[PDB]
Structures are given as structure tokens and as C-alpha cells.
């Protein structure tokens, strides 16, 4: 249920930083951004109108690390919900447990966030949760258990977590090593460079 | 009925009943089927590496 191959190849193919290279050091420097995606990737960037719809599908999926079958269920769930389907698509992806672990800054990367959640270190409202796909709703507290607390893996992430955006929709805390999800994020608070109108089109046909 | 044999070369003749999947591709006059290589008594394509799913070629140990 995971990629396991090279994370930067996914970032180089899209031509945008997916934040899988967050870790200790960030903002690339060493990159080779686009220019040679493969061996003959230096060929002209002209691409079909069908392909750019499929390209944006991969851009969103490769950030969070979701597979097409698992992603189809979130699109199917986003369609049945009220309001805009595109806005609810990213909302259900943002409602994942491992993503909320990444935003608060417990995991350094999004892959490490799923890695830490898999070992049952994260507890929500007291009870432990193994599954990274667990749906987080408003007024749901989250925290790391007494076992594996204040380790060099989790401690290094929380230090450098302050340097990033620091999202408004949840409290960072990091004093007692817990967190709280206040409300569902707004359209202005996410997306921007990634588009919702492009990704949604491909499943209509 | 009649059926095309895919792949490079075969041992197929006379007896030893073989599997026939079907499907239409147009080359000979009136050929509406295809034989399955690497099934029942039908030999697979020797020394093939790409497209192992088609033609019944097993994965080499490495």
C-alpha cells in the first residue's frame, strides 16, 4: 500500500516540490529540477490536453502517498458530500490522520508521518489508532503516547516545524507533545498552486 | 474452427489438447480466435523477457 521507491523522482517528474524532501535540510539547493526526468526527459515540455489532467492527479496523490483505488473512494465520498466536489476532495485528504501528524510537525516528512502512525505511537481522544487513513473530525484531540516520547526522531521534527507556514486551522502546541484539530480548513488556507478543477475532470469520462 | 498461433515458434501438432482464449485480429482470411501459449500442453515462447503475462513465459531466477 506504499510507494517505497525514490521520492525525489516523483518530485522531479511533476516539476514542483512535493515536500517529501522536508526532513532536516530543505529548499533543495541540490535539485536538477525538471530538465532530465528520465534519460530522454530533456525533450521539449509540450504535453497533451488529456495528459495535464492526469498529471495533476499524480501531483495531489504523490504528496499524500495515496493509491488510485483508495483515492477513488475519497473522490466517490467527495461527490456525495454537499457543496463543491473539488474543495471536499482535498478536505477528505486533509482529514487523514497521517496528514494531521505532518501539519502539527511530529513527522519530518509525510512518509515518516505514516511510518510513525503505523507503529501505534499516535493516540486520538485517549484511544490508539494504527491506520493512517483514519478520518479526523472537529474537536478531536491527538497526542503521542508515553512510550517512544521525546525521541530524536520526533524531537528534531518539532524544532524545524516552527520554520514552516504554521497552519491556522490547528494548534501546534508541542509543549506537552499533543495537538487539537479545531475546524475544517478553508479554500484559501490550502491548494493555491495545486488545482481542484483539473484533477476532478478525469473521472467524469 | 481455425485459430492463430502467437509467439515465435511452437511444438503444437496432432494431439495434446490446448487452451484457446479467442479474440479477433485480422490477417488470414477468416480467423476469429487465438491460442493460449504456456497452458495445458501448449509450450510458451522460449528466451522471451518482456511481456511474460502474454505467451505463458515464467520468471527467470535471479
Amino acid at each position: 500500500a506504499r510507494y517505497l521507491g525514490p521520492k525525489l523522482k516523483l518530485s522531479r517528474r511533476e516539476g514542483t516540490d512535493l515536500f517529501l524532501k522536508s526532513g532536516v535540510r530543505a529548499i533543495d539547493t541540490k535539485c536538477k529540477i525538471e530538465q532530465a526526468p528520465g534519460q530522454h526527459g530533456a525533450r521539449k515540455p509540450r504535453l497533451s490536453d488529456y495528459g495535464v489532467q492526469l498529471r495533476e492527479k499524480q501531483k495531489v496523490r504523490r504528496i499524500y502517498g495515496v493509491l488510485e483505488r483508495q483515492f477513488r473512494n475519497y473522490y466517490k465520498e467527495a461527490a456525495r458530500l454537499k457543496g463543491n466536489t473539488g474543495e471536499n476532495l482535498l478536505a477528505l485528504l486533509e482529514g487523514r490522520l497521517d496528514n494531521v501528524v505532518y501539519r502539527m510537525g511530529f513527522g519530518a516528512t509525510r512518509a515518516e508521518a505514516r511510518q510513525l502512525v503505523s507503529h501505534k505511537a499516535i493516540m486520538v481522544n485517549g484511544r490508539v489508532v494504527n491506520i493512517a487513513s483514519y478520518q479526523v473530525s472537529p474537536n478531536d484531540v491527538v497526542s503521542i503516547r508515553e512510550k517512544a516520547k521525546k525521541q530524536s526522531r520526533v524531537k528534531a521534527a518539532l524544532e524545524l516545524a516552527e520554520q514552516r507556514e504554521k497552519p491556522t486551522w490547528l494548534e501546534v502546541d508541542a509543549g506537552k507533545m499533543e495537538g487539537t484539530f479545531k475546524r475544517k480548513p478553508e479554500r484559501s488556507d490550502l491548494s493555491a498552486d495545486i488545482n481542484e478543477h483539473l484533477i476532478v475532470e478525469l473521472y467524469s469520462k | 474452427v481455425t485459430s492463430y498461433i502467437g509467439g515465435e515458434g511452437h511444438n503444437l501438432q496432432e494431439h495434446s489438447v490446448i487452451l484457446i482464449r479467442g479474440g479477433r485480429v485480422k490477417d488470414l482470411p477468416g480467423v476469429r480466435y487465438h491460442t493460449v501459449r504456456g497452458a495445458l500442453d501448449c509450450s510458451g515462447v522460449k528466451d522471451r523477457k518482456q511481456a511474460r503475462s502474454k505467451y505463458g513465459v515464467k520468471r527467470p531466477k535471479a
Binding site: - | 511444438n11 501438432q13 496432432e14 494431439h15 495434446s16 489438447v17 500442453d41 509450450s43 515464467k58
Partner: protein, 509 residues
Amino acid sequence: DTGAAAEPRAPVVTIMGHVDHGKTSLLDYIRSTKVASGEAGGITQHIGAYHVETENGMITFLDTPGHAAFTSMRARGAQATDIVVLVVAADDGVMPQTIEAIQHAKAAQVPVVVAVNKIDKPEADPDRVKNELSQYGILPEEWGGESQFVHVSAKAGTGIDELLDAILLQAEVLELKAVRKGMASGAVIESFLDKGRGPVATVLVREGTLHKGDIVLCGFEYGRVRAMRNELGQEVLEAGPSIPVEILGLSGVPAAGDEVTVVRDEKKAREVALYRQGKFREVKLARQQKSKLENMFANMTEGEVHEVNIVLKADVQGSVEAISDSLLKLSTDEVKVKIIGSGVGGITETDATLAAASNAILVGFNVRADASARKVIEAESLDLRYYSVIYNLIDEVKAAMSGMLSPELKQQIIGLAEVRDVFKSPKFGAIAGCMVTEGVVKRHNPIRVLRDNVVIYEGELESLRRFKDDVNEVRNGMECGIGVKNYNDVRTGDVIEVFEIIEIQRTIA
């Protein structure tokens, strides 16, 4: 197979010989059964193992018939058994089938004890047997070669006491190694197919242990045992390394014989069984490509291309491999015979269909027609023949082959005639007046027209006409007339040779 536990076992014994030494009689008398001559053929064409309880201890008996045809059965029966017995008759002496059994005893490094079958007949003497088999290193007596001879009536039922003792002792002098509990393993005697019960096998278990829940793997076949049957006994709960028990519940009919090993779980044994199939299938296609490419030409270099096809399904698995080898012995260069789709048992739709595509005889050692089988056989023109014995089969297949031949060995001249004073006809273009010097000229018999000893033209007569009579036959020294189509030039002095055509017929050998 852990703990290294060593427990004594009942010795498995096989018996070999030339047909007719009353090899079966020895068993049946001990078994107090006498099933001999109760079955078709009067002789034993099948293999079976029967354990009896007699002092001292326990012993089981196995028997294989000795014939040119059963090359495999006697080979496998020797290596499986700890002790081999060779029956010999003072009247029969030594025979080429008996010496064949000698090799199976030494090559399998199995100790051998023998018995003189006839003490009843006055023309039978032991001294003849000892001396004539003396030449062969096997069967020494009191020469320091440790081998012991037994003299039994086999009809009289006379001991026997000595033979039995030798067998017990011969098994006693050598250490008997087995284990009561552990990993079960062994060999398969004979396998066949049943309609209600399903596919079954008769298995000798080297290490003796069994259970209804235990998974067993025979060759490339795998499965859980549904039930256990021992000889007459319909059900047995437990089976030891000594006594044989028929196994049931296997996926399909296994090989006629092989090594069988039980496993803890079936899932782990699935990949192994499928692995053996892949190798057996790979060599099957391998041997298929070689035989076809071996000729290195698009056809046969000569006229032996005419062949006969046969379809065989025998109830027992042991026969189809064994008798086919004997069925390939009768094969000849002229007419080639080949087996197609050897079955495990009975008959089936795809089998009758197999004989429908290519014309063939459908035969079985022992088989019955299925309800769906009768409909196909009765509709299209075919032949269903079942034979109790292999000898009646081996004879008729040859018969089928002998008939196939179409040889005419005679091209003797019927008459020879010289033509003179040609006449003209509208229909044939020419009429050559003739005078028969020898023999009788006939209408439809072929002719050879030759001039100066070389043949100018050849053909078959269309019209034989003398005057306006147009008689079909003309004798010698009687004026005659002749004409033929496609013959342009008639010249005097040439002679026409008419000859009848006859077929000698052919036999196979």
C-alpha cells in the same frame, strides 16, 4: 524423522519367476484364500500386497507376475522389498524370464531365498535346479554362499516349514530398522481410479504412521486423506510401517510408483507439487520438439508414412506405462503404431472425442461405458472393445496392423501378343491387328507395349475386339484385335505384353 527410534518391522517380500511356477499358489495357500484361477486369464496380471499373521512374528507378502511385458513392475518390486524370493521348478528349470529376475535381485542388492515348487512330480529333481543355477553366482547351496534352498509341494501344501523359517531367519539375521512414530514416507505399489471412492493408491509406508487429518503428498499430486482401507478391511484407524494400506482422497491418480512423503500443512506442499508438474511438462514439450525435429526433413524419406492410431484407457495406473512398453515392442518400420491419451481409468467424453478426430481403436484393460459415453460411441462409427488379458490385446493390435498392409507381389504376364497390319478407328484412333503367341488376352488387365526389348508405351486395355464380336477374351494362336486411347504410332514387329495384377498380402513380424 527425529529421535532416532529403532523398532523391528515385518519384512516385505516379493516373488519372481517364469510364468507358471505356481507363484500365486504359494501365497493363496498361506492366505488360505485360493483366489487363483478365480479371475479371468487364469494367471495374475496385477500386483497386490497381502499381510498375514503367522508365527513367528509378522510378515507380509507381495507378488509380481513375470512376463516379457512387465519390465517396470518387477524392477520396482525388487528395490522396495527387503527380501526377494525366486520360484523355480525342477521341470521348468531355468528360463530367460527367470534369469531376468536374477538381475533384479542383485542390482537391488536384496538378499534372495528360493523354493523348489514341484516335489510332487516324479520327473522333477532338485539336483538339476541347483547345478544348472550353480553357474550363475546366485543361489549357492552349502558352498559357503549363505543361500538356502527350500523344497515345497505348493499343491500338497507341504512345508513350507523350511521356507517360512528361512524367510523369517533371513529377515532376522539382518537388522530390521523402522520407527513407530515420526514423519511418514514410503512407496506406491499400484494406483487406480474408482467412480464413487475416487482416485486411490496402494502405498507401502517405510516409516509407519498415519492419520485422517494428516496431509500426504504423492509425486506431483497432493491432498488430504479422506479414508483408509486395508485389504478386505473396509476401515482402519492406524497403519504401521509393516502392513500396507490403500490411500484415498488424493487429488488425482498418481504415477504407477514413486516416493510418497507426508507433510504438516497442505498449503506448503501446494507449490512443491505444482513445481514437479512444471518440470514434467517442460520435458514433455522438450521431448516433443526433438522427435519432430529429429527427422530434419519435411516428411519421411520413404513410404512408411502410413500408420495406425490407438486410444487406451486402463483402470489401473500400473498397466498403462508397463504394457505400452510392450506395445512399442511390436512396432515395426513398415507400420508404425502409437498410443494417444493414456487414461487413468474408465472412459470419458473427451476420450471418445479423441478417437473421433483421428480414426483409432478404443481399448481398455478393464473398462465400462459411461452413460454419456454410450451416446457418442453409438452415434458416430467407432469401436469399443475391452480385454481381460494383455495377451489377447497384444495379438489383435498386431492383427490390425497386419491387415493395414496392401502388398501385391505378382505381375505375371497373362498373355503376350504381337501386332500386325494396323487398322484405323474413329474412336481410339487406331486398331492394331494382333496374333497371340502365348497365354490369354483379357480386357481390364494392364498391358506393356515394347519395341526392341525397350518399352515404347504403357497402358491398360480399353477395347478388345475381334471382328464385330468384341469378345472380352482371346486365347493364343487365335486371330485377335486391339486398340487403346493415347497411343499414336503403331509399328509392326513390336510385341504387347499383357499381365495380371495380384496381391500376395502381408503379415506382421
